[PDB]
Amino acid sequence: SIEGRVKDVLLLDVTPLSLGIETMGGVMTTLIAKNTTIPTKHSQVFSTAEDNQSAVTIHVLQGERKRAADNKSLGQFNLDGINPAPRGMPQIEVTFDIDADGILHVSAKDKNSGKEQKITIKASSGLNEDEIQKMVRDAEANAEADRKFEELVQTRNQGDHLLHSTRKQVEEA
C-alpha cells in the first residue's frame, strides 16, 4: 500500500511524470504522458491565446495532477513573429517526440508556414508523489496559485487550447 498514482516506472518504461505546458488557471496539462514508451512520437495541436499565430512561450511542465504542484521544470522560451496575425486560429500544432536515447525532441510547429522551433531537453530525475503533494500544500496553495495566476494567467482561469501567449514581459530565465 504505497498508493502509487503520480509516478509509475516499473512495468512502464515510459516518459517519467507526465509532461507538457503550464496551462491557464494555474494548472498542469501533460503533452506526453506516462504509458508512452520511449522512443515515443505523438502530436498535440493547440492554438495561441491572444495571437492567431504570432507567439508561443514554451514553458513545458513535467508533473501530473491538475492542482499545480506539478511544476517540474521543462521550462523554455518563446517562438515569436509568426506573421502579423492576432487572436484565435486555431492552428499551431505542437508535436512531442522523445528519442530512444532520452532527449525531448519537441517542435512547436506552426500552421502559418511551418515556422517551427525544436527543443532538445535533457530529462532524467527522481521526484516522488509528495514532492508533488508536499508541494500541493506549501507550494500548490501559494507557488503557482499566486505566481502563475498573476503573470501567467492574468488571473482569470480558462482552460485548454488557448495556451496563454504573452506578448510583452519576456520571461528571462
Side-chain angles (χ1 to χ4, degrees), residues 43-107:
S43 307
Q44 287 287 283
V45 52
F46 293 118
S47 187
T48 25
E50 194 174 89
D51 300 328
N52 165 308
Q53 57 195 352
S54 179
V56 275
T57 300
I58 293 299
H59 166 218
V60 193
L61 216 77
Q62 176 167 315
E64 193 269 303
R65 223 75 176 85
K66 62 184 293 299
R67 266 69 63 180
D70 293 313
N71 193 278
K72 197 274 179 179
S73 303
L74 209 182
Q76 242 289 327
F77 298 122
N78 62 79
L79 203 163
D80 61 270
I82 312 161
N83 190 272
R87 197 146 175 180
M89 183 50 181
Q91 300 188 290
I92 297 283
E93 67 186 84
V94 179
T95 336
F96 222 87
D97 168 275
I98 206 168
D99 302 82
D101 300 293
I103 188 77
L104 272 166
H105 184 269
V106 359
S107 58

Short mmCIF file of all heavy atoms in Angstrom, two decimals, residues 43-107:
data_model
loop_
_atom_site.label_atom_id
_atom_site.label_comp_id
_atom_site.label_asym_id
_atom_site.label_seq_id
_atom_site.Cartn_x
_atom_site.Cartn_y
_atom_site.Cartn_z
N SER A 43 1.46 13.66 -31.66
CA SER A 43 1.16 15.06 -31.98
C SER A 43 0.03 15.60 -31.11
O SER A 43 -0.99 14.94 -30.91
CB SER A 43 0.71 15.11 -33.43
OG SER A 43 1.67 14.47 -34.26
N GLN A 44 0.22 16.83 -30.64
CA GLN A 44 -0.85 17.50 -29.89
C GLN A 44 -0.96 18.93 -30.40
O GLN A 44 -0.05 19.73 -30.24
CB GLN A 44 -0.48 17.53 -28.40
CG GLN A 44 -0.61 16.15 -27.76
CD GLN A 44 -2.07 15.76 -27.58
OE1 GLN A 44 -2.76 16.22 -26.68
NE2 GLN A 44 -2.56 14.89 -28.45
N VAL A 45 -2.09 19.26 -31.01
CA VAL A 45 -2.26 20.57 -31.64
C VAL A 45 -3.07 21.51 -30.74
O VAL A 45 -4.11 21.15 -30.21
CB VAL A 45 -2.91 20.36 -33.01
CG1 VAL A 45 -4.18 19.52 -32.93
CG2 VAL A 45 -3.28 21.67 -33.71
N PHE A 46 -2.56 22.73 -30.58
CA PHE A 46 -3.26 23.74 -29.78
C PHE A 46 -3.22 25.08 -30.53
O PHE A 46 -2.67 25.18 -31.63
CB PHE A 46 -2.58 23.84 -28.41
CG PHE A 46 -2.76 22.58 -27.60
CD1 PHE A 46 -1.70 21.85 -27.24
CD2 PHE A 46 -4.00 22.20 -27.23
CE1 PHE A 46 -1.87 20.74 -26.51
CE2 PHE A 46 -4.16 21.09 -26.49
CZ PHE A 46 -3.10 20.36 -26.13
N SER A 47 -3.82 26.11 -29.93
CA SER A 47 -3.84 27.44 -30.54
C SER A 47 -3.16 28.43 -29.61
O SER A 47 -2.94 28.17 -28.43
CB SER A 47 -5.29 27.91 -30.69
OG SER A 47 -5.35 29.12 -31.44
N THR A 48 -2.84 29.59 -30.16
CA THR A 48 -2.30 30.65 -29.31
C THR A 48 -3.48 31.39 -28.71
O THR A 48 -4.59 31.35 -29.24
CB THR A 48 -1.48 31.56 -30.20
OG1 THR A 48 -1.96 31.47 -31.53
CG2 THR A 48 -0.01 31.14 -30.20
N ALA A 49 -3.28 32.06 -27.59
CA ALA A 49 -4.42 32.69 -26.93
C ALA A 49 -4.77 34.04 -27.53
O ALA A 49 -5.85 34.22 -28.09
CB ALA A 49 -4.11 32.87 -25.44
N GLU A 50 -3.86 35.00 -27.39
CA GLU A 50 -4.13 36.36 -27.83
C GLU A 50 -3.52 36.58 -29.21
O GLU A 50 -3.60 37.66 -29.79
CB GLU A 50 -3.54 37.31 -26.79
CG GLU A 50 -4.06 38.74 -26.95
CD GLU A 50 -3.55 39.62 -25.82
OE1 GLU A 50 -2.46 40.21 -25.95
OE2 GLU A 50 -4.25 39.72 -24.78
N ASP A 51 -2.90 35.52 -29.73
CA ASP A 51 -2.36 35.57 -31.09
C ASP A 51 -3.09 34.50 -31.90
O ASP A 51 -3.54 33.48 -31.39
CB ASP A 51 -0.86 35.35 -31.08
CG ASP A 51 -0.17 36.43 -30.26
OD1 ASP A 51 -0.67 37.58 -30.24
OD2 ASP A 51 0.87 36.14 -29.64
N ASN A 52 -3.22 34.75 -33.20
CA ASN A 52 -3.80 33.76 -34.08
C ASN A 52 -2.64 32.83 -34.32
O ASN A 52 -2.67 31.61 -34.18
CB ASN A 52 -4.23 34.50 -35.35
CG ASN A 52 -4.56 33.68 -36.59
OD1 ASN A 52 -3.77 32.85 -37.04
ND2 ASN A 52 -5.70 33.95 -37.20
N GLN A 53 -1.56 33.51 -34.64
CA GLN A 53 -0.30 32.82 -34.84
C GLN A 53 0.74 33.93 -34.78
O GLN A 53 0.99 34.66 -35.73
CB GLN A 53 -0.33 32.00 -36.14
CG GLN A 53 -0.63 32.78 -37.42
CD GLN A 53 -1.00 31.82 -38.55
OE1 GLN A 53 -0.89 30.61 -38.43
NE2 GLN A 53 -1.46 32.38 -39.66
N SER A 54 1.35 34.09 -33.62
CA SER A 54 2.44 35.05 -33.53
C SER A 54 3.41 34.68 -32.42
O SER A 54 4.60 34.97 -32.54
CB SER A 54 1.95 36.49 -33.45
OG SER A 54 3.06 37.37 -33.34
N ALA A 55 2.97 34.03 -31.35
CA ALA A 55 3.96 33.62 -30.35
C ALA A 55 3.47 32.56 -29.38
O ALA A 55 2.34 32.60 -28.90
CB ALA A 55 4.39 34.83 -29.52
N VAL A 56 4.36 31.63 -29.06
CA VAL A 56 4.05 30.63 -28.03
C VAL A 56 5.22 30.64 -27.06
O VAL A 56 6.37 30.41 -27.43
CB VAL A 56 3.91 29.18 -28.53
CG1 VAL A 56 2.50 28.89 -29.04
CG2 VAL A 56 4.91 28.80 -29.62
N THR A 57 4.95 30.88 -25.79
CA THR A 57 6.04 30.77 -24.82
C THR A 57 6.13 29.26 -24.69
O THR A 57 5.09 28.64 -24.86
CB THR A 57 5.62 31.42 -23.51
OG1 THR A 57 5.34 32.79 -23.73
CG2 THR A 57 6.74 31.31 -22.47
N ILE A 58 7.28 28.61 -24.49
CA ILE A 58 7.21 27.17 -24.37
C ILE A 58 7.76 27.17 -22.97
O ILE A 58 8.73 27.87 -22.69
CB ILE A 58 7.99 26.56 -25.53
CG1 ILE A 58 7.32 26.82 -26.89
CG2 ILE A 58 8.19 25.06 -25.32
CD1 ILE A 58 5.91 26.25 -27.06
N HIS A 59 6.98 26.54 -22.12
CA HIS A 59 7.26 26.51 -20.68
C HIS A 59 6.65 25.15 -20.38
O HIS A 59 5.47 25.03 -20.04
CB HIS A 59 6.52 27.64 -19.97
CG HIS A 59 6.48 27.45 -18.47
ND1 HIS A 59 5.38 27.77 -17.69
CD2 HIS A 59 7.51 26.90 -17.70
CE1 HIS A 59 5.86 27.35 -16.48
NE2 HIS A 59 7.12 26.82 -16.38
N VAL A 60 7.49 24.14 -20.61
CA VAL A 60 6.96 22.80 -20.52
C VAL A 60 6.91 22.39 -19.07
O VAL A 60 7.84 22.68 -18.32
CB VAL A 60 7.73 21.86 -21.46
CG1 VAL A 60 7.10 20.49 -21.69
CG2 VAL A 60 8.01 22.50 -22.82
N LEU A 61 5.84 21.71 -18.70
CA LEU A 61 5.68 21.38 -17.28
C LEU A 61 5.54 19.88 -17.03
O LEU A 61 4.51 19.27 -17.28
CB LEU A 61 4.51 22.18 -16.71
CG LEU A 61 4.77 22.61 -15.26
CD1 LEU A 61 5.73 23.81 -15.19
CD2 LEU A 61 3.46 23.04 -14.60
N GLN A 62 6.63 19.35 -16.49
CA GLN A 62 6.66 17.94 -16.07
C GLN A 62 6.18 17.76 -14.64
O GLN A 62 6.88 17.95 -13.65
CB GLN A 62 8.08 17.42 -16.29
CG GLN A 62 8.25 15.98 -15.80
CD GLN A 62 9.56 15.39 -16.31
OE1 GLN A 62 9.92 15.52 -17.47
NE2 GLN A 62 10.28 14.73 -15.42
N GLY A 63 4.93 17.33 -14.57
CA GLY A 63 4.31 16.98 -13.30
C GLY A 63 3.08 16.15 -13.69
O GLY A 63 3.05 15.65 -14.81
N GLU A 64 2.07 15.99 -12.84
CA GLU A 64 0.95 15.09 -13.19
C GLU A 64 -0.45 15.66 -12.93
O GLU A 64 -1.20 15.95 -13.86
CB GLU A 64 1.20 13.77 -12.45
CG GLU A 64 0.32 12.62 -12.94
CD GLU A 64 -0.99 12.50 -12.18
OE1 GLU A 64 -0.95 12.36 -10.94
OE2 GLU A 64 -2.07 12.54 -12.81
N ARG A 65 -0.81 15.78 -11.66
CA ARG A 65 -2.18 16.19 -11.30
C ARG A 65 -2.60 17.56 -11.85
O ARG A 65 -1.82 18.26 -12.50
CB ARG A 65 -2.24 16.19 -9.77
CG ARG A 65 -3.52 15.57 -9.21
CD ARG A 65 -3.52 14.04 -9.33
NE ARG A 65 -4.72 13.47 -8.70
CZ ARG A 65 -5.87 13.36 -9.35
NH1 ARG A 65 -6.01 13.76 -10.60
NH2 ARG A 65 -6.91 12.84 -8.73
N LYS A 66 -3.85 17.93 -11.60
CA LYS A 66 -4.37 19.20 -12.11
C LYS A 66 -4.12 20.32 -11.10
O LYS A 66 -4.01 21.49 -11.48
CB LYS A 66 -5.85 19.08 -12.49
CG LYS A 66 -6.76 18.72 -11.32
CD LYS A 66 -8.22 18.52 -11.76
CE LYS A 66 -8.90 19.79 -12.26
NZ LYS A 66 -8.94 20.81 -11.20
N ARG A 67 -4.02 20.00 -9.82
CA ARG A 67 -3.65 21.05 -8.86
C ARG A 67 -2.19 21.23 -9.18
O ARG A 67 -1.45 20.25 -9.20
CB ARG A 67 -3.83 20.61 -7.40
CG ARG A 67 -5.19 21.00 -6.81
CD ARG A 67 -6.37 20.25 -7.41
NE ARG A 67 -6.25 18.82 -7.13
CZ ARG A 67 -7.18 17.98 -7.57
NH1 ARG A 67 -8.21 18.43 -8.25
NH2 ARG A 67 -7.07 16.69 -7.32
N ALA A 68 -1.75 22.45 -9.45
CA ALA A 68 -0.37 22.61 -9.91
C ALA A 68 0.72 22.57 -8.84
O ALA A 68 1.21 23.58 -8.33
CB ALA A 68 -0.27 23.85 -10.81
N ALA A 69 1.12 21.33 -8.56
CA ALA A 69 2.27 21.04 -7.69
C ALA A 69 3.04 20.11 -8.60
O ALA A 69 3.85 19.26 -8.23
CB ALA A 69 2.03 20.32 -6.36
N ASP A 70 2.70 20.33 -9.86
CA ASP A 70 3.18 19.52 -10.97
C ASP A 70 4.09 20.45 -11.75
O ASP A 70 4.07 20.50 -12.98
CB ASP A 70 1.87 19.18 -11.66
CG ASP A 70 1.10 18.27 -10.73
OD1 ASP A 70 1.70 17.31 -10.20
OD2 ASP A 70 -0.11 18.49 -10.53
N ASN A 71 4.95 21.11 -10.99
CA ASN A 71 5.82 22.13 -11.56
C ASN A 71 7.25 21.65 -11.67
O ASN A 71 8.18 22.26 -11.13
CB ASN A 71 5.74 23.35 -10.64
CG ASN A 71 6.35 24.59 -11.28
OD1 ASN A 71 7.56 24.80 -11.27
ND2 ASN A 71 5.50 25.45 -11.82
N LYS A 72 7.45 20.55 -12.40
CA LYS A 72 8.82 20.11 -12.65
C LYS A 72 9.27 20.89 -13.87
O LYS A 72 8.56 21.03 -14.87
CB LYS A 72 8.86 18.58 -12.72
CG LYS A 72 10.27 18.01 -12.56
CD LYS A 72 11.06 17.93 -13.86
CE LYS A 72 12.45 17.37 -13.60
NZ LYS A 72 13.20 17.28 -14.87
N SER A 73 10.47 21.45 -13.79
CA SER A 73 10.91 22.34 -14.86
C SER A 73 11.28 21.65 -16.17
O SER A 73 12.24 20.88 -16.26
CB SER A 73 12.12 23.12 -14.35
OG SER A 73 11.76 23.83 -13.17
N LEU A 74 10.51 21.99 -17.18
CA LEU A 74 10.79 21.53 -18.54
C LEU A 74 10.66 22.86 -19.30
O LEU A 74 10.37 22.98 -20.49
CB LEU A 74 9.88 20.32 -18.84
CG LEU A 74 10.39 19.27 -19.84
CD1 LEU A 74 9.30 18.21 -20.00
CD2 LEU A 74 10.72 19.75 -21.25
N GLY A 75 10.94 23.91 -18.53
CA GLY A 75 10.76 25.29 -18.99
C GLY A 75 11.44 25.66 -20.30
O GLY A 75 12.36 24.98 -20.76
N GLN A 76 10.97 26.73 -20.92
CA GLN A 76 11.50 27.07 -22.24
C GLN A 76 11.63 28.56 -22.49
O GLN A 76 12.24 29.31 -21.73
CB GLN A 76 11.00 26.07 -23.29
CG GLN A 76 12.15 25.30 -23.94
CD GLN A 76 13.00 26.15 -24.87
OE1 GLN A 76 12.52 27.08 -25.53
NE2 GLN A 76 14.28 25.82 -24.96
N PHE A 77 11.25 28.93 -23.68
CA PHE A 77 11.46 30.31 -24.15
C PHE A 77 10.23 30.80 -24.88
O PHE A 77 9.12 30.74 -24.38
CB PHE A 77 12.75 30.40 -25.00
CG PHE A 77 14.00 30.05 -24.24
CD1 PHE A 77 14.79 29.05 -24.65
CD2 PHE A 77 14.36 30.78 -23.17
CE1 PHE A 77 15.92 28.76 -23.99
CE2 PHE A 77 15.49 30.49 -22.50
CZ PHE A 77 16.26 29.48 -22.91
N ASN A 78 10.48 31.34 -26.04
CA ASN A 78 9.39 31.87 -26.85
C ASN A 78 9.64 31.87 -28.35
O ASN A 78 10.65 32.37 -28.85
CB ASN A 78 9.04 33.28 -26.37
CG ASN A 78 10.22 34.23 -26.55
OD1 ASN A 78 10.50 34.72 -27.64
ND2 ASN A 78 10.92 34.50 -25.46
N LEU A 79 8.68 31.32 -29.08
CA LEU A 79 8.73 31.38 -30.54
C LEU A 79 8.04 32.71 -30.82
O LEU A 79 7.07 33.01 -30.13
CB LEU A 79 7.95 30.17 -31.08
CG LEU A 79 8.32 29.73 -32.51
CD1 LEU A 79 7.80 28.31 -32.74
CD2 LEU A 79 7.71 30.59 -33.60
N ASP A 80 8.54 33.53 -31.72
CA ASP A 80 7.92 34.86 -31.90
C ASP A 80 7.95 35.33 -33.34
O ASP A 80 8.83 35.00 -34.13
CB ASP A 80 8.65 35.87 -31.02
CG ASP A 80 10.12 35.97 -31.41
OD1 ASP A 80 10.94 35.20 -30.86
OD2 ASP A 80 10.45 36.81 -32.27
N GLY A 81 6.97 36.15 -33.68
CA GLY A 81 6.91 36.69 -35.03
C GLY A 81 6.48 35.61 -36.00
O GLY A 81 7.27 35.19 -36.84
N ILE A 82 5.23 35.16 -35.89
CA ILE A 82 4.76 34.11 -36.81
C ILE A 82 3.78 34.81 -37.75
O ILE A 82 2.60 34.48 -37.79
CB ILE A 82 4.09 32.92 -36.09
CG1 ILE A 82 4.88 32.37 -34.89
CG2 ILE A 82 3.83 31.77 -37.07
CD1 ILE A 82 3.99 31.54 -33.96
N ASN A 83 4.30 35.81 -38.45
CA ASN A 83 3.50 36.65 -39.36
C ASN A 83 2.46 37.51 -38.59
O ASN A 83 1.86 36.99 -37.65
CB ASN A 83 2.83 35.82 -40.46
CG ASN A 83 2.21 36.70 -41.54
OD1 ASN A 83 1.07 37.13 -41.45
ND2 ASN A 83 2.98 36.98 -42.58
N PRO A 84 2.16 38.78 -38.89
CA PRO A 84 1.17 39.53 -38.11
C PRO A 84 -0.23 38.94 -38.18
O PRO A 84 -0.89 38.94 -39.22
CB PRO A 84 1.19 40.91 -38.78
CG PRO A 84 2.59 41.03 -39.37
CD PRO A 84 2.92 39.61 -39.83
N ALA A 85 -0.68 38.39 -37.07
CA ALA A 85 -1.97 37.71 -37.07
C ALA A 85 -2.49 37.62 -35.62
O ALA A 85 -1.87 36.87 -34.86
CB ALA A 85 -1.72 36.30 -37.60
N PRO A 86 -3.58 38.26 -35.17
CA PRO A 86 -3.92 38.23 -33.74
C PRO A 86 -5.16 37.39 -33.40
O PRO A 86 -6.06 37.15 -34.21
CB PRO A 86 -4.25 39.70 -33.49
CG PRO A 86 -4.95 40.12 -34.78
CD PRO A 86 -4.15 39.41 -35.87
N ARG A 87 -5.18 37.00 -32.13
CA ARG A 87 -6.20 36.11 -31.51
C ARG A 87 -6.96 35.04 -32.31
O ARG A 87 -7.66 35.32 -33.28
CB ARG A 87 -7.17 37.03 -30.77
CG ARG A 87 -7.99 36.22 -29.77
CD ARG A 87 -8.28 37.06 -28.53
NE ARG A 87 -9.17 36.31 -27.63
CZ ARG A 87 -9.55 36.85 -26.49
NH1 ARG A 87 -9.13 38.06 -26.15
NH2 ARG A 87 -10.35 36.18 -25.68
N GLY A 88 -6.87 33.78 -31.86
CA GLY A 88 -7.67 32.72 -32.47
C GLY A 88 -7.16 32.26 -33.83
O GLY A 88 -6.85 33.09 -34.68
N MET A 89 -7.12 30.95 -34.06
CA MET A 89 -6.74 30.46 -35.40
C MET A 89 -7.53 29.20 -35.82
O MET A 89 -8.32 29.36 -36.74
CB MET A 89 -5.22 30.38 -35.52
CG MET A 89 -4.75 29.96 -36.91
SD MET A 89 -5.54 30.94 -38.20
CE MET A 89 -4.79 30.16 -39.64
N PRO A 90 -7.47 27.97 -35.27
CA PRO A 90 -6.69 27.58 -34.09
C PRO A 90 -5.60 26.57 -34.50
O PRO A 90 -5.68 25.40 -34.13
CB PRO A 90 -7.78 26.87 -33.29
CG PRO A 90 -8.61 26.14 -34.34
CD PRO A 90 -8.57 27.05 -35.56
N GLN A 91 -4.58 27.00 -35.24
CA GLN A 91 -3.60 26.03 -35.78
C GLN A 91 -2.11 26.28 -35.51
O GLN A 91 -1.42 26.96 -36.27
CB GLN A 91 -3.74 26.01 -37.30
CG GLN A 91 -5.13 25.58 -37.76
CD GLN A 91 -5.16 25.38 -39.27
OE1 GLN A 91 -5.08 26.33 -40.05
NE2 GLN A 91 -5.28 24.14 -39.69
N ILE A 92 -1.61 25.72 -34.42
CA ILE A 92 -0.18 25.74 -34.13
C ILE A 92 0.02 24.31 -33.63
O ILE A 92 -0.24 24.04 -32.46
CB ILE A 92 0.25 26.70 -33.02
CG1 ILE A 92 -0.03 28.17 -33.35
CG2 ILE A 92 1.74 26.44 -32.82
CD1 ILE A 92 0.98 28.77 -34.32
N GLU A 93 0.40 23.38 -34.48
CA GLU A 93 0.49 22.00 -33.98
C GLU A 93 1.76 21.91 -33.15
O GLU A 93 2.75 22.57 -33.43
CB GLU A 93 0.43 20.99 -35.12
CG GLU A 93 1.65 21.07 -36.04
CD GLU A 93 1.46 20.15 -37.24
OE1 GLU A 93 0.82 20.57 -38.23
OE2 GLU A 93 1.97 19.01 -37.21
N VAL A 94 1.69 21.14 -32.07
CA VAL A 94 2.84 21.06 -31.16
C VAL A 94 3.15 19.58 -31.03
O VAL A 94 2.47 18.84 -30.32
CB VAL A 94 2.51 21.69 -29.80
CG1 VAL A 94 3.70 21.57 -28.85
CG2 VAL A 94 2.18 23.18 -29.96
N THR A 95 4.17 19.16 -31.76
CA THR A 95 4.46 17.73 -31.79
C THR A 95 5.42 17.41 -30.66
O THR A 95 6.24 18.24 -30.26
CB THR A 95 5.05 17.35 -33.14
OG1 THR A 95 4.63 18.29 -34.12
CG2 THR A 95 4.50 15.98 -33.50
N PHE A 96 5.27 16.21 -30.13
CA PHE A 96 6.04 15.82 -28.96
C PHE A 96 6.60 14.44 -29.19
O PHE A 96 5.86 13.46 -29.32
CB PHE A 96 5.11 15.87 -27.76
CG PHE A 96 5.82 16.48 -26.58
CD1 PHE A 96 5.82 17.81 -26.41
CD2 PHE A 96 6.45 15.70 -25.70
CE1 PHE A 96 6.43 18.35 -25.35
CE2 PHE A 96 7.03 16.24 -24.62
CZ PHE A 96 7.02 17.56 -24.44
N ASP A 97 7.91 14.38 -29.35
CA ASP A 97 8.54 13.11 -29.70
C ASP A 97 9.77 12.97 -28.85
O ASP A 97 10.60 13.87 -28.83
CB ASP A 97 8.96 13.19 -31.17
CG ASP A 97 9.89 12.05 -31.57
OD1 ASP A 97 11.12 12.18 -31.37
OD2 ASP A 97 9.40 11.03 -32.10
N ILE A 98 9.91 11.84 -28.17
CA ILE A 98 11.16 11.65 -27.42
C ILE A 98 11.97 10.67 -28.24
O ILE A 98 11.42 9.82 -28.95
CB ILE A 98 10.83 11.20 -26.00
CG1 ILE A 98 11.91 11.56 -24.97
CG2 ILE A 98 10.63 9.71 -26.00
CD1 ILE A 98 11.35 11.34 -23.57
N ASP A 99 13.28 10.75 -28.14
CA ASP A 99 14.11 9.84 -28.93
C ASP A 99 14.36 8.62 -28.07
O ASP A 99 13.86 8.52 -26.95
CB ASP A 99 15.43 10.53 -29.26
CG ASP A 99 15.18 11.82 -30.03
OD1 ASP A 99 14.89 12.85 -29.39
OD2 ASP A 99 15.27 11.81 -31.27
N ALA A 100 15.14 7.68 -28.58
CA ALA A 100 15.37 6.46 -27.81
C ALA A 100 16.55 6.66 -26.86
O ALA A 100 16.76 5.88 -25.93
CB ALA A 100 15.69 5.32 -28.78
N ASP A 101 17.32 7.71 -27.08
CA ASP A 101 18.46 7.96 -26.21
C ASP A 101 17.99 8.71 -24.98
O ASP A 101 18.56 8.57 -23.90
CB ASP A 101 19.50 8.79 -26.97
CG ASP A 101 19.97 8.04 -28.21
OD1 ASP A 101 20.64 7.00 -28.06
OD2 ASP A 101 19.68 8.50 -29.33
N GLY A 102 16.93 9.49 -25.14
CA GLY A 102 16.34 10.16 -23.98
C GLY A 102 16.58 11.66 -24.05
O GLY A 102 17.15 12.26 -23.14
N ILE A 103 16.12 12.25 -25.14
CA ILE A 103 16.18 13.71 -25.26
C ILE A 103 14.84 14.11 -25.86
O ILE A 103 14.32 13.44 -26.76
CB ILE A 103 17.39 14.13 -26.11
CG1 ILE A 103 17.61 15.64 -26.11
CG2 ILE A 103 17.22 13.75 -27.58
CD1 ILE A 103 18.25 16.11 -24.81
N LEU A 104 14.24 15.16 -25.33
CA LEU A 104 12.90 15.50 -25.81
C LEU A 104 12.97 16.37 -27.04
O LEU A 104 13.21 17.58 -27.00
CB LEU A 104 12.11 16.21 -24.72
CG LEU A 104 11.36 15.22 -23.83
CD1 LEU A 104 10.91 15.99 -22.60
CD2 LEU A 104 10.13 14.67 -24.54
N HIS A 105 12.70 15.69 -28.13
CA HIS A 105 12.61 16.37 -29.42
C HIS A 105 11.18 16.87 -29.62
O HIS A 105 10.33 16.13 -30.11
CB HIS A 105 12.98 15.37 -30.51
CG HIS A 105 13.01 16.02 -31.87
ND1 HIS A 105 11.93 16.10 -32.73
CD2 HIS A 105 14.16 16.58 -32.45
CE1 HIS A 105 12.55 16.72 -33.79
NE2 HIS A 105 13.88 17.04 -33.72
N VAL A 106 10.92 18.12 -29.24
CA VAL A 106 9.56 18.66 -29.40
C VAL A 106 9.66 19.93 -30.24
O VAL A 106 10.53 20.77 -30.04
CB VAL A 106 8.84 18.87 -28.05
CG1 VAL A 106 9.67 18.45 -26.84
CG2 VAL A 106 8.26 20.27 -27.86
N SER A 107 8.76 20.04 -31.22
CA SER A 107 8.83 21.15 -32.16
C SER A 107 7.51 21.87 -32.16
O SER A 107 6.47 21.31 -32.52
CB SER A 107 9.09 20.59 -33.55
OG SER A 107 8.06 19.67 -33.90
#
